[PDB]
CSV table of C-alpha atoms and ligand atoms in Angstrom, one decimal:
chain,number,residue,atom,x,y,z
I,1,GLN,CA,-0.5,-43.2,-38.9
I,2,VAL,CA,-3.7,-41.4,-37.1
I,3,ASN,CA,-4.1,-37.8,-36.8
I,4,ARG,CA,-1.8,-35.7,-34.5
I,5,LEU,CA,-2.9,-32.1,-33.9
I,6,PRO,CA,-0.7,-28.9,-34.8
I,7,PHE,CA,1.4,-27.6,-32.3
I,8,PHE,CA,2.7,-24.0,-32.2
I,9,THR,CA,5.9,-23.1,-32.4
I,10,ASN,CA,6.4,-19.3,-31.2
I,11,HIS,CA,8.5,-18.4,-28.3
I,12,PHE,CA,5.7,-15.8,-26.9
I,13,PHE,CA,3.7,-18.6,-25.9
I,14,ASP,CA,6.1,-19.6,-23.1
I,15,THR,CA,6.8,-16.0,-22.3
I,16,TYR,CA,4.6,-12.8,-23.2
I,17,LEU,CA,4.1,-10.6,-26.3
I,18,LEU,CA,5.0,-7.0,-25.9
I,19,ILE,CA,3.4,-4.9,-28.1
I,20,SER,CA,3.8,-0.9,-28.4
I,21,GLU,CA,0.7,1.1,-27.8
I,22,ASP,CA,1.8,3.2,-31.1
I,23,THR,CA,1.1,0.4,-33.2
I,24,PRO,CA,-1.3,1.4,-35.9
I,25,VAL,CA,-4.5,-0.1,-36.7
I,26,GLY,CA,-4.4,-2.1,-39.6
I,27,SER,CA,-0.6,-3.4,-38.8
I,28,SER,CA,0.8,-6.8,-38.4
I,29,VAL,CA,1.7,-7.5,-34.6
I,30,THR,CA,3.2,-11.1,-35.2
I,31,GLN,CA,2.5,-14.2,-37.3
I,32,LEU,CA,1.6,-17.4,-35.2
I,33,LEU,CA,3.5,-20.5,-36.5
I,34,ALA,CA,2.8,-24.0,-36.2
I,35,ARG,CA,4.0,-27.4,-37.2
I,36,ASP,CA,1.6,-30.4,-38.0
I,37,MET,CA,3.5,-33.8,-38.3
I,38,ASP,CA,0.8,-35.2,-40.7
I,39,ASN,CA,1.8,-31.9,-43.1
I,40,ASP,CA,-2.0,-30.8,-42.7
I,41,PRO,CA,-3.2,-27.8,-44.0
I,42,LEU,CA,-3.9,-25.4,-41.2
I,43,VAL,CA,-6.3,-22.7,-40.2
I,44,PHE,CA,-5.5,-20.3,-37.5
I,45,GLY,CA,-7.6,-18.2,-35.3
I,46,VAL,CA,-8.2,-16.1,-32.2
I,47,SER,CA,-10.5,-17.3,-29.5
I,48,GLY,CA,-12.5,-15.0,-27.0
I,49,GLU,CA,-14.7,-12.2,-27.0
I,50,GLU,CA,-12.1,-9.4,-25.9
I,51,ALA,CA,-9.1,-10.8,-27.8
I,52,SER,CA,-11.2,-10.9,-31.0
I,53,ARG,CA,-12.0,-7.2,-30.4
I,54,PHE,CA,-8.6,-6.1,-30.8
I,55,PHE,CA,-6.8,-8.8,-32.9
I,56,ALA,CA,-7.8,-10.3,-36.3
I,57,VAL,CA,-5.8,-13.4,-37.5
I,58,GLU,CA,-5.6,-14.2,-41.0
I,59,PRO,CA,-6.9,-17.9,-41.2
I,60,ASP,CA,-4.5,-19.0,-43.8
I,61,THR,CA,-1.4,-18.0,-42.6
I,62,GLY,CA,-1.7,-17.0,-38.8
I,63,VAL,CA,-0.7,-13.3,-39.4
I,64,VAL,CA,-2.2,-11.2,-36.4
I,65,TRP,CA,-3.3,-7.7,-37.0
I,66,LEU,CA,-4.7,-4.8,-35.1
I,67,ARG,CA,-8.2,-4.1,-35.2
I,68,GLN,CA,-8.6,-1.5,-32.6
I,69,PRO,CA,-6.1,0.7,-30.9
I,70,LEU,CA,-4.3,-0.4,-27.9
I,71,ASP,CA,-3.9,2.1,-25.1
I,72,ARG,CA,-1.3,1.8,-22.1
I,73,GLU,CA,-3.0,4.2,-20.2
I,74,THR,CA,-6.3,2.0,-20.3
I,75,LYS,CA,-4.9,-1.6,-20.1
I,76,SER,CA,-1.4,-2.5,-20.1
I,77,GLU,CA,-1.8,-6.2,-19.9
I,78,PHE,CA,-4.3,-8.8,-20.6
I,79,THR,CA,-4.4,-12.3,-21.8
I,80,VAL,CA,-5.8,-13.6,-25.4
I,81,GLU,CA,-5.9,-17.3,-26.7
I,82,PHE,CA,-5.2,-18.2,-30.3
I,83,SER,CA,-5.9,-21.2,-32.0
I,84,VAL,CA,-4.6,-23.6,-34.8
I,85,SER,CA,-6.7,-26.4,-36.8
I,86,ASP,CA,-5.6,-29.0,-39.1
I,87,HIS,CA,-9.3,-29.3,-40.4
I,88,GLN,CA,-10.0,-32.5,-37.9
I,89,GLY,CA,-9.1,-30.8,-34.4
I,90,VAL,CA,-8.0,-27.7,-32.8
I,91,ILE,CA,-5.9,-26.2,-30.2
I,92,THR,CA,-6.0,-23.0,-28.3
I,93,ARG,CA,-3.1,-21.6,-26.4
I,94,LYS,CA,-3.0,-18.5,-24.1
I,95,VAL,CA,-0.6,-15.5,-24.5
I,96,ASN,CA,0.2,-12.7,-22.2
I,97,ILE,CA,0.2,-9.7,-23.8
I,98,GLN,CA,2.0,-6.5,-22.3
I,99,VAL,CA,1.1,-3.0,-24.0
I,100,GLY,CA,4.2,-1.0,-24.1
I,101,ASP,CA,4.1,2.8,-23.3
I,102,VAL,CA,4.9,5.5,-25.7
I,103,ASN,CA,4.8,9.3,-25.0
I,104,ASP,CA,1.5,9.9,-26.5
I,105,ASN,CA,-0.2,12.4,-24.0
I,106,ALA,CA,0.9,16.0,-23.7
I,107,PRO,CA,0.3,17.5,-20.1
I,108,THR,CA,-3.3,18.5,-19.0
I,109,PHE,CA,-4.0,21.9,-16.8
I,110,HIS,CA,-6.2,21.5,-13.8
I,111,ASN,CA,-8.6,24.2,-12.5
I,112,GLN,CA,-8.5,26.6,-15.3
I,113,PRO,CA,-9.4,29.5,-16.0
I,114,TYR,CA,-6.3,30.7,-14.3
I,115,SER,CA,-6.6,34.5,-13.1
I,116,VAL,CA,-5.4,36.4,-10.2
I,117,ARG,CA,-5.6,40.1,-9.2
I,118,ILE,CA,-2.4,41.7,-7.7
I,119,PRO,CA,-1.7,45.3,-6.7
I,120,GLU,CA,0.6,47.4,-9.0
I,121,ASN,CA,2.7,47.8,-5.7
I,122,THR,CA,3.3,44.0,-5.1
I,123,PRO,CA,6.8,43.6,-4.0
I,124,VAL,CA,9.2,42.1,-6.2
I,125,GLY,CA,9.6,38.5,-4.9
I,126,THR,CA,6.0,37.8,-4.1
I,127,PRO,CA,4.7,34.5,-4.9
I,128,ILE,CA,1.3,34.9,-6.7
I,129,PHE,CA,-0.1,31.9,-8.2
I,130,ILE,CA,0.7,28.0,-8.7
I,131,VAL,CA,-0.2,26.4,-11.9
I,132,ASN,CA,-0.9,22.8,-12.2
I,133,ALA,CA,-0.5,19.7,-14.9
I,134,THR,CA,0.0,16.3,-15.0
I,135,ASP,CA,0.8,13.9,-17.6
I,136,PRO,CA,-0.2,9.9,-17.4
I,137,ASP,CA,2.8,8.7,-19.7
I,138,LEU,CA,5.4,6.7,-17.8
I,139,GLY,CA,9.0,8.0,-17.0
I,140,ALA,CA,10.4,11.2,-18.4
I,141,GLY,CA,7.2,11.3,-20.6
I,142,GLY,CA,5.0,11.9,-17.4
I,143,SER,CA,7.6,14.6,-16.0
I,144,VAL,CA,6.3,18.3,-16.5
I,145,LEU,CA,8.2,21.5,-16.9
I,146,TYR,CA,6.5,24.9,-16.9
I,147,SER,CA,7.6,28.0,-18.4
I,148,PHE,CA,6.4,31.6,-19.6
I,149,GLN,CA,6.3,31.4,-23.7
I,150,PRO,CA,8.1,33.7,-24.4
I,151,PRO,CA,9.8,34.6,-21.2
I,152,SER,CA,8.2,37.5,-19.4
I,153,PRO,CA,10.4,40.5,-18.0
I,154,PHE,CA,7.6,40.7,-15.1
I,155,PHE,CA,6.8,37.2,-14.0
I,156,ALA,CA,9.0,34.0,-13.3
I,157,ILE,CA,7.6,30.4,-12.9
I,158,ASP,CA,9.2,27.9,-11.3
I,159,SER,CA,9.8,24.9,-14.0
I,160,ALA,CA,9.2,22.1,-11.6
I,161,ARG,CA,6.7,23.7,-8.9
I,162,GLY,CA,4.5,25.8,-11.1
I,163,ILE,CA,5.0,28.9,-8.5
I,164,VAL,CA,4.7,32.2,-10.4
I,165,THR,CA,6.7,35.4,-8.9
I,166,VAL,CA,6.8,38.8,-9.6
I,167,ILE,CA,10.3,40.0,-10.9
I,168,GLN,CA,9.8,43.6,-11.8
I,169,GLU,CA,7.9,46.4,-10.6
I,170,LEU,CA,4.3,46.9,-11.7
I,171,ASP,CA,2.5,50.0,-12.9
I,172,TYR,CA,-0.9,50.2,-13.7
I,173,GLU,CA,-0.4,53.3,-15.5
I,174,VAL,CA,1.6,51.2,-18.2
I,175,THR,CA,-0.3,47.8,-18.0
I,176,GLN,CA,-3.5,47.1,-16.4
I,177,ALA,CA,-3.8,43.6,-17.1
I,178,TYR,CA,-1.3,40.5,-18.3
I,179,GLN,CA,-2.3,37.9,-20.4
I,180,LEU,CA,0.7,35.0,-20.1
I,181,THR,CA,1.0,31.6,-22.0
I,182,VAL,CA,2.2,29.1,-19.9
I,183,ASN,CA,3.7,26.3,-21.6
I,184,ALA,CA,4.1,22.9,-19.8
I,185,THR,CA,6.4,20.2,-21.6
I,186,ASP,CA,7.3,16.7,-20.7
I,187,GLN,CA,10.6,15.5,-20.7
I,188,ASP,CA,10.5,12.5,-23.2
I,189,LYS,CA,13.8,12.5,-24.9
I,190,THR,CA,12.8,11.7,-28.2
I,191,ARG,CA,9.3,13.0,-28.9
I,192,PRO,CA,8.4,15.4,-26.0
I,193,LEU,CA,4.9,16.8,-26.0
I,194,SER,CA,3.3,20.3,-25.0
I,195,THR,CA,0.1,22.0,-23.8
I,196,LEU,CA,-0.4,25.7,-23.7
I,197,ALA,CA,-2.8,27.7,-21.0
I,198,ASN,CA,-3.3,31.4,-20.2
I,199,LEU,CA,-2.9,32.9,-16.9
I,200,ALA,CA,-4.5,36.3,-16.4
I,201,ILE,CA,-3.2,38.8,-14.1
I,202,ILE,CA,-5.2,41.7,-13.4
I,203,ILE,CA,-3.4,44.6,-11.9
I,204,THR,CA,-5.1,46.5,-9.1
I,205,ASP,CA,-4.5,50.6,-9.5
I,206,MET,CA,-3.1,51.9,-6.3
I,207,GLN,CA,-3.1,55.5,-5.3
I,208,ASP,CA,0.4,56.1,-6.0
I,209,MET,CA,1.2,59.5,-7.6
I,210,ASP,CA,4.6,60.8,-6.8
X,1,CA,CA1,-2.7,-33.4,-38.1
X,2,CA,CA1,-2.1,6.0,-24.7
X,3,CA,CA1,1.6,6.6,-23.1
X,4,CA,CA1,3.7,12.7,-21.9
X,5,CA,CA1,2.1,53.3,-11.3
X,6,CA,CA1,-1.8,54.0,-9.8
């Protein structure tokens, strides 16, 4: 019986291999599995420059491990080729890789620093500022809610829109400036992430002696 080449048996050679982006470097991703009808000893590998940058393959076993972090936010799908040889010949076969998203970004505020000057006689109800953050994670992990931390008795903030309003009469003679902490938190159900930003509110002294 003349030589037959080995063949792979993993299902993912027909469909795709989904790997979560939170897979730690150094962790195994899968094991390549193959059969050689001559019962030859096998050597497993990875074929291609980019593929070899992200994946290492144990030659004696076909265990695939991660060499560099995956990042769904940079590249979420790509192709690799894996190899198996019986020391006589070698086959290479493509696999579609999809990188699975996790919530691994907190929100980023834009156009900082935040500051605004308002008169001490600004009427309650007046909108005075709009904060802005974004978050690149998918789904609920990319949805941002705003709040003041702790809640302010002088200013409200719309948790969806980021619009800040005056909610109590101001008084320069008591407070000449506020330094408010804005919290932006994403809405991931399992592991929400937060970012803080300052909003400085400078109060203009008005000639308001009673
Ligand atoms: Ca063989
Ligand atoms: Ca990421
Ligand atoms: Ca992510
Ligand atoms: Ca997020
Ligand atoms: Ca006053
Ligand atoms: Ca005054």
